[PDB]
């Protein structure tokens, strides 16, 4: 089967939607997620550094957001609050679903953090990514449905920051 000389498939590049003007941060990147750097060192290594925590402080700096230290995973949104940072159950691109402990889609212990890659259906089902946590072996992705418990309890932070190269008061300064 051809259309042309061959049969060429693309349509996924379009599958999902970016959110583009996630947060006021993200807006800028043309809704594109900012780079990762695995060589990148953050001071946030003082708390549970094989918890979802870990790969949500590295993959909040990913997306150019440096945050205070919290607890641990339901912690964040309380520490949200005191950072001056909102909370919200809107999807948005980018940046990362806190889920509460002992709540549909967290782990009943600590809660749970995901990161979302894309907004789906406009904003049904997110998609969302992790390196391993949650999954052994490899990395897995899943798609959670806002209308769904799941999704219910998937809580969003909003940064206020959109200043990534600058050292933050909470972020490297535990002490005041």
Known sequence: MEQSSGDKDGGSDSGGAQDGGSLDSLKKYNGKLPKHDPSFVQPGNRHY??????????????????????????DWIGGAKGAGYGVGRTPKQGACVIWQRGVQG???????????????????????????????????????????????????????????????????????
Not at 59 to 68: E, F, K, M
Not at 124 to 149: L, Q, W
Not at 150 to 173: E, M, T, W
């Open 106 to 176: 967290g782990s009943p212990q600590y809660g749970h953090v995901a990161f979302v890659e894309k907004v789906l259906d406009g904003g049904k089902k997110i998609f969302i990514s992790e390196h391993n946590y949650a999954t052994p072996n490899g990395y897995g992705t899943r798609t959670i449905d806002m209308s769904s418990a799941i999704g219910k309890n998937a809580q969003f932070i909003y940064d206020k920051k959109k200043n990534s190269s600058s050292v933050d008061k909470l972020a490297a300064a535990l002490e005041h």
């Open 49 to 74: 550094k094989y918890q979802c925590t870990w790969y949500a402080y590295n993959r909040r700096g990913q997306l150019g957001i440096p945050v205070p230290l919290w607890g641990d995973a339901a």
